[PDB]
Amino acid sequence: APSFPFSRASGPEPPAEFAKLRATNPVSQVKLFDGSLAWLVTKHKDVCFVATSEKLSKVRTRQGFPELSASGKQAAKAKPTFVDMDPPEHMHQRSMVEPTFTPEAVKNLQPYIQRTVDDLLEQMKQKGCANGPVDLVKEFALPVPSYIIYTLLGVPFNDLEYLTQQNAIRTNGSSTAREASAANQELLDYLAILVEQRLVEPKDDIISKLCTEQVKPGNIDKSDAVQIAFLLLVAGNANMVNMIALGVATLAQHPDQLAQLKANPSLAPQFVEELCRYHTASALAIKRTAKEDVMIGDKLVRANEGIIASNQSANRDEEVFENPDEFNMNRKWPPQDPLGFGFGDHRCIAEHLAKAELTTVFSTLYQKFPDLKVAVPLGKINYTPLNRDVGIVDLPVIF
Ligand code: HEM
Numbered sequence: 001a002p003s004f005p006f007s008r009a010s011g012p013e014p015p016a017e018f019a020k021l022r023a024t025n026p027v028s029q030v031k032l033f034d035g036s037l038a039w040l041v042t043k044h045k046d047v048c049f050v051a052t053s054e055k056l057s058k059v060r061t062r063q064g065f066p067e068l069s070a071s072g073k074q075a076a077k078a079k080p081t082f083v084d085m086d087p088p089e090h091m092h093q094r095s096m097v098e099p100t101f102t103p104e105a106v107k108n109l110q111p112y113i114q115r116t117v118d119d120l121l122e123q124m125k126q127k128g129c130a131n132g133p134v135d136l137v138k139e140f141a142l143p144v145p146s147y148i149i150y151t152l153l154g155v156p157f158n159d160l161e162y163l164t165q166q167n168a169i170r171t172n173g174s175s176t177a178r179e180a181s182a183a184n185q186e187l188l189d190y191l192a193i194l195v196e197q198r199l200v201e202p203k204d205d206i207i208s209k210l211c212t213e214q215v216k217p218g219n220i221d222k223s224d225a226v227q228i229a230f231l232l233l234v235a236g237n238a239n240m241v242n243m244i245a246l247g248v249a250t251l252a253q254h255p256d257q258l259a260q261l262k263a264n265p266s267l268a269p270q271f272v273e274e275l276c277r278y279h280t281a282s283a284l285a286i287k288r289t290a291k292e293d294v295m296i297g298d299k300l301v302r303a304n305e306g307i308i309a310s311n312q313s314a315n316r317d318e319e320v321f322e323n324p325d326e327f328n329m330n331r332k333w334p335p336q337d338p339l340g341f342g343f344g345d346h347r348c349i350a351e352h353l354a355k356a357e358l359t360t361v362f363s364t365l366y367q368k369f370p371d372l373k374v375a376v377p378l379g380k381i382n383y384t385p386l387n388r389d390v391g392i393v394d395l396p397v398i399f
Contacts, residue, residue, distance in 0.1 A: 002031065004030035014280075018316065026043045030308070033068065036066070043314065048336075049296060050288055050309035052344040053288075059080070059084060060080065064290070066287050066308050081224075081227050097206060097210070100206055117365075120139070125368070125369075129399060136248060136395040137245055137392065141392075142164060146160070146167060146168075148357060149232065150233070187233065188226060198211045207229050211225060242392060246390065248365070249392060250327055257327070261329070268360075270329050276355070279390055280340055284308070284389065311343070321338075376396050382395075
């Protein structure tokens with residue numbers, strides 16, 4: 001059994017193993033860092049099955065849960081939030097914060113999302129690039145999602161820049177372990193003060209709704225409100241930054257699709273759909289243990305065995321998406337959902353928000369900067385390390 005996680009074939013590519021597995025051994029065992037085995041599921045139909053089967057559990061205290069690193073094993077000891085819950089606990093807690101993220105709520109947030117993108121783009125223009133390239137990640141891909149989720153949580157405008165930097169430090173490849181852990185606990189300490197403040201005087205933000213609707217009636221405690229707020233911050237922010245940067249690189253890589261998007265910004269939603277299929281920035285979250293025996297394809301997954309369902313692989317499944325390794329914004333979509341945001345009851349709470357942020361970015365960026373260019377050769381883009389989820393660390397641009 002091969003070691004898992006697998007490394008990407010190159011900067012912008014999935015691991016090479018998945019295509020071969022889909023063709024010749026779609027449900028197979030892999031070896032995790034601790035020597036334990038897990039079942040790896042690679043076909044779209046089977047990933048959806050894993051995502052939805054009530055015979056499977058997300059609870060990390062079940063033996064056989066496929067932790068992929070030493071750090072994950074240690075994080076499993078903590079009081080879980082809804083990301084690691086099964087029904088009925090899962091929706092009992094998730095429903096406390098889903099209102100801000102519904103399709104209708106996100107449609108009403110569109111003018112705010114647009115303003116945030118417009119202001120950061122105008123910022124960038126004022127900075128200018130007269131003295132040379134600027135980093136699109138630091139100047140734009142990082143602050144767009146950061147400012148939005150912090151604002152929705154309740155952070156005031158003057159604190160956004162500092163906290164945006166600190167949250168980046170938590171996941172920056174270059175941070176030492178100490179630096180990332182200090183940033184982590186710093187964010188937590190900050191959120192704990194906001195919860196104290198919003199309990200005494202609520203405002204129009206997610207933390208206030210938690211305080212008023214859940215903490216004060218005793219449904220959860222202050223510490224739970226902090227952890228829920230924290231989960232909303234850290235679960236998706238790095239994914240958003242990576243998807244923005246990857247989208248700019250992808251357009252540069254396929255000039256006539258960029259030309260189409262510039263000529264017709266109304267194409268941004270379909271560009272974003274293709275982007276979230278082709279670049280599956282979160283490929284390791286659909287994990288389970290079997291509560292009881294379950295058959296998947298030609299395999300028996302026994303009780304207390306772990307399962308990893310690769311949505312990245314599913315998004316390249318030739319049986320579902322014709323010419324899956326082709327980036328095509330004009331893709332003819334099948335009835336089966338792309339799985340960039342997962343599937344089933346745990347499907348990304350923020351899927352609609354994330355797509356709206358991305359659509360806003362890709363319908364505005366090249367109207368603002370029609371001559372935006374990556375300022376290094378595309379082959380020299382600094383991607384995340386190959387043993388991680390796909391992403392971009394920094395992206396020099398001119399405009
Ligand atoms: C493009 C950006 C994003 C991508 C690709 C992404 C992807 C995902 C995926 C693959 C999952 C796993 C879903 C499953 O278990 O089937 C997930 C879960 C989740 N995401 Fe996102 N996400 C993004 C942005 C966000 C944002 C902006 C937030 C918060 C504001 C967020 C919050 C969450 C939460 C809380 C979960 C756990 C849901 C649950 O288990 O019930 N995500 N996301």
